Design a protein around this ligand. Structure first.
Ligand SMILES: [Mg+2]
Ligand SMILES: [Mg+2]
Ligand SMILES: [Mg+2]
Ligand SMILES: [Mg+2]
Ligand SMILES: [Mg+2]
Ligand SMILES: [Mg+2]
Ligand SMILES: [Mg+2]
Ligand SMILES: [Mg+2]
Ligand SMILES: [Mg+2]
Ligand SMILES: [Mg+2]
Ligand SMILES: [Mg+2]
Ligand SMILES: [Mg+2]
Ligand SMILES: [Mg+2]
Lengths: 50, 61, 354, 63, 60, 153, 107
RNA sequence: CGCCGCAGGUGCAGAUCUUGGUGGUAGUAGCAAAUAUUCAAACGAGAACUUUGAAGGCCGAAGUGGAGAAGGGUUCCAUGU
């Protein structure tokens, strides 16, 4: 909602910031083994815990 | 051109605080250059100045 | 189709006076540049002399625009080119024996005339300049003489590139990586026909094959370093910008719109400098460049202790002989080198004159 | 090409609905260049964007 | 417009801008961005021009 | 790459190939059998006619529920259809094979489709929603196609 | 010549008979386009917007019984297109349809 | 891996067996609740579906309108693919 507490807004801020693709230069690191961010979250698919 | 802990140790509180202030104004300038494009040389000095501030503060404490 | 070519007598004559006005201001710059002078002072007086000379010329016709085609670019001992400080930027004082690289262009009726020359200020009488600096300027001038000889319809643009690479390898030096000469026509400085200098894989495969054609101008550039040829930036403000009329965008800034209109009024498509305004100019330029209305001409630094030289000039391509309209004052009697040229083909081209 | 932004901005500037916004079908390229409400105002002044009249609902029959 | 520490209040922002830029400020508006950074709109005094202050800061 | 049925001599032959092409495997298999053995000019004219619904491909093996048409009588069959997407995909592969023939330097006015094969590609997963809170698959059935054209006049 | 123009009258009532209410005017334009393909022999038929407005003048189900059109076969002027010619069909307002023949018309 | 001994979590067709994969069904059922689309043009490799214009219709102010609470959490807005 528009009305939110500071704790809720700060929780939503961190969830937003980590919902981004991996940098492309990660894939060139030695012994990488990581293809893409498997923890990507879409707002419509999966709802947040709170 | 760097700062080291050993040659900071003979200095007095006033000139240690002055050296802390000069590093802090340079770090703020580097953060300005970071958000205005800047250069790779200016971006890489951010860590150098940040470690210098930690070095001065460690000696002070 | 509507471009104007050099087949007309009046177009020929105004090129001759366009390079004449370019040569006399470069000559005035070289004499005036000495020890204890300010680069900002040189840029302003070199620009001011252009303004009054191009204003007093053709007093009977006051309709067609005349002005600067490239701002005075003075780079000394650490910068490649595209360097012109503002008033706020700290000045550079000229020490003894510094090599300086001066760029200067002037356009009449939309056709440009671009000249540039590298020289060392305050050459003492009775002495001889010796060092690793001795070879870079001399080899660059031999590139200018070579390109002057081999500019002709039928000689491919690639033959220019490996010839410059060959003489650079003769002097055990390398050019600046990926510098760009251009083919010139009316009201443009960035024609599609282009010449690459010291390429790599990326540049050579994005570059084009072309054959020299009659009735067109060539701003050919030699630019050789004494180190590795690599370049980058060191947090210095970009001053030279040029308007690209291909694209447009709705500017949402009042100061940027006023700045962009003043660019269109004075320097409609030719490159300009931020010195020609200042507080609002540096404000509107960023939001114009962000949406790519102006193409930045950034400053390029080599590593400390390296020295770089350059020459460039506009040569008209006319069938039975090409002529160099603008020339810089280079004299090989007062300047020698510790290594020479050892290729017979290079000997043939230098000895045969146009 | 697509003028969904320009119709929305024109309706807000003209204080009407998107029903009443008329964008010139022939000056499509000019209108597409307008990405600001002030550019929209310039096109409205120049006649490239017109506010259409209200659909007639006469009361003559009722009277 | 500045990005400021989320703990700083308007009085601290006002004094911090005044000290390390040597300018006088009129009022400070403050919001917290959706990504969690606090943003401060620091209006300058009428005799201070925000254009050339941003020039000497280096963000023009 | 490994084609099945390598050409009898790889000097008068050209090849083309596609993988994970998002067309129905069953429709494309029937279209491929229709143009197999055709001259390249005849196959192009026929595939364009299938799109225009002037000629049909006979559905011989995957004919469950396929309707009847008058144009199936051209073949010895009764059921036929006009798979537009299969015809377009085979027309792209025929243009690619024809350009490959020009690169090999062999004339394209005598090319004959001597080999053509449609294989099943890995399926792509989607979902459909059923009556009582159930989920069922909505799989796509893409296909690999390979063809070899050889000159004979 | 192939830049001929002619005025026809089309019995829309004849070609619309039996069509459902919500399809009568869409089918009238399909039949007008099919009429122009038959008479002028060009696959590219372009219905004029006045003609479209005339067919839909009385709504979707009460299409006019007769319409007086004019077929104009013209060169495409886009040789990149597969069609050398196209037929532009326009609307000819008339007060009555009695004794109206198919007529060749000038320019 | 053979031979002499030693020791087993030691042999599968089943268990509505467990996990994984794949068929026929089958190019089948189906993509049928709330009246409805049409013409021209633009962009574009490509247009029944995008955009603009022109028509014809619907919601009919207890709206298919304009705004909020809860809930969502960036879905908002530009640009590009
Ligand atoms: Mg939900
Ligand atoms: Mg607040
Ligand atoms: Mg059956
Ligand atoms: Mg059935
Ligand atoms: Mg369902
Ligand atoms: Mg359910
Ligand atoms: Mg067991
Ligand atoms: Mg088993
Ligand atoms: Mg069915
Ligand atoms: Mg159905
Ligand atoms: Mg109604
Ligand atoms: Mg509502
Ligand atoms: Mg949106």
């Amino acid at each position: 909602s528009s009305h939110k507490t500071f704790r809720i807004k700060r929780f939503l801020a961190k969830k937003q910031k980590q919902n981004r693709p991996i940098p492309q230069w990660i894939r060139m690191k030695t012994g990488n083994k990581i293809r893409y961010n498997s923890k990507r979250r879409h707002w419509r698919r999966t709802k947040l815990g709170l | 051109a760097k700062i080291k802990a050993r040659d900071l140790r003979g200095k007095k509180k006033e000139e240690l605080l002055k050296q802390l202030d000069d590093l802090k104004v340079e770090l703020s300038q580097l953060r300005v250059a970071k958000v205005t494009g800047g250069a790779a040389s200016k971006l890489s000095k951010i860590r150098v100045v940040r470690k210098s501030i930690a070095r001065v503060l460690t000696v002070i404490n | 189709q509507q471009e104007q070519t050099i087949a007309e007598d009046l177009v020929v004559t105004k090129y001759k006076m366009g390079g004449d006005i370019a040569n006399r201001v470069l000559r005035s710059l070289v004499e005036a540049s000495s020890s204890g002078v300010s680069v900002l002072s040189l840029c302003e007086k070199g620009d001011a002399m252009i303004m009054e000379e191009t204003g007093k010329i053709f007093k009977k016709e006051k309709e067609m625009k005349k002005g600067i085609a490239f701002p005075t670019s003075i780079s000394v001992n650490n910068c490649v080119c595209h360097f012109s400080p503002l008033k706020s930027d700290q000045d550079y004082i000229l020490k003894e024996g510094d090599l300086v690289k001066i760029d200067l262009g002037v356009h009449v009726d939309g056709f440009i005339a671009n000249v540039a020359h590298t020289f060392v200020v305050d050459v003492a009488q009775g002495t001889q300049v010796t060092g690793r600096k001795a070879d870079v300027i001399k080899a660059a001038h031999l590139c200018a003489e070579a390109a002057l000889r081999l500019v002709k319809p039928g000689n491919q643009n690639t033959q220019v590139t490996e010839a410059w690479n060959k003489v650079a390898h003769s002097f055990n030096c390398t050019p600046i990586e990926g510098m760009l000469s251009h083919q010139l026509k009316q009201h443009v400085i960035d024609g599609e026909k282009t010449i690459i200098q010291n390429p790599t894989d990326q540049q050579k495969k994005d570059h084009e094959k072309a054959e020299f054609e009659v009735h067109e101008v060539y701003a050919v550039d030699v630019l050789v370093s004494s180190g590795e040829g690599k370049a980058k930036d060191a947090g210095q403000r970009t001053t030279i910008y040029k308007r690209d009329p291909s694209k447009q965008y709705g500017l949402k800034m009042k100061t940027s719109r006023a700045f962009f209109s003043e660019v269109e009024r004075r320097f409609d498509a030719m490159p300009f400098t931020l010195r020609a305004f200042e507080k609002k100019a540096r404000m509107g330029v960023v939001e114009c460049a962000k949406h790519e209305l102006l193409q930045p001409f950034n400053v390029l630094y080599e590593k400390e202790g390296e020295f770089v030289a350059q020459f460039k000039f506009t040569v008209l391509l006319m069938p039975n002989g090409p002529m160099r309209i603008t020339s810089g004052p280079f004299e090989p009697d007062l300047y020698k080198s510790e290594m020479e040229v050892q290729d017979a083909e290079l000997k043939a081209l230098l000895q045969s004159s146009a | 090409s697509m003028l969904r932004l320009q119709k929305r901005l024109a309706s807000s500037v003209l204080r009407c609905g998107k029903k009443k916004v008329w964008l010139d079908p022939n000056e499509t390229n000019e209108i597409a260049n307008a990405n600001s409400r002030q550019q929209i105002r310039k096109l409205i002044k120049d006649g490239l964007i017109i506010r259409k009249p209200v659909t007639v609902h006469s009361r003559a029959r009722c009277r | 417009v500045f990005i400021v520490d989320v703990k700083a209040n308007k009085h601290q922002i006002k004094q911090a801008v005044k000290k390390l830029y040597d300018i006088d400020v009129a009022k400070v508006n403050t919001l917290i961005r959706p990504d969690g950074e606090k943003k401060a709109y620091v209006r300058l005094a009428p005799d201070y021009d925000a254009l050339d202050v941003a020039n000497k800061i280096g963000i023009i | 790459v490994r084609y099945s049925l390598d050409p009898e001599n790889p000097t008068k032959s050209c090849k083309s190939r596609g993988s994970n092409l998002r067309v129905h495997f069953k429709n494309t298999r029937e279209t491929a059998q229709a143009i197999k053995g055709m001259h390249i000019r005849k196959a192009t004219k026929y595939l364009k006619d299938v799109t225009l619904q002037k000629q049909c491909v006979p559905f011989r093996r995957y004919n469950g529920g396929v309707g009847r048409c008058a144009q199936a009588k051209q073949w010895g069959w009764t059921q036929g259809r006009w798979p537009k997407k299969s015809a377009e995909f085979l027309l792209h592969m025929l243009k690619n094979a024809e350009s490959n023939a020009e690169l090999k330097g062999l004339d394209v006015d005598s090319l004959v489709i001597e080999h053509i094969q449609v294989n099943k590609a890995p399926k792509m997963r989607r979902r459909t929603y059923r009556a009582h809170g159930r989920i069922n698959p909505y799989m796509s059935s893409p296909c690999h196609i390979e063809m070899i054209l050889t000159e004979k006049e | 010549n192939e830049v001929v123009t002619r005025e026809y009258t089309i019995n829309i009532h004849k070609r619309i008979h039996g069509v459902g209410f919500k399809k009568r005017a869409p089918r009238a334009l399909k039949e007008i386009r099919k009429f122009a393909m038959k008479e002028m022999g060009t696959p590219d038929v372009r219905i004029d917007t006045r003609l479209n407005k005339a067919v839909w003048a009385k709504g979707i189900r009460n299409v006019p019984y007769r319409i007086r059109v004019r077929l104009s076969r013209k060169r495409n002027e886009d040789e990149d297109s597969p069609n050398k010619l196209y037929t532009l069909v326009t609307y000819v307002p008339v007060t009555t349809f009695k004794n109206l023949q198919t007529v060749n018309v000038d320019e």
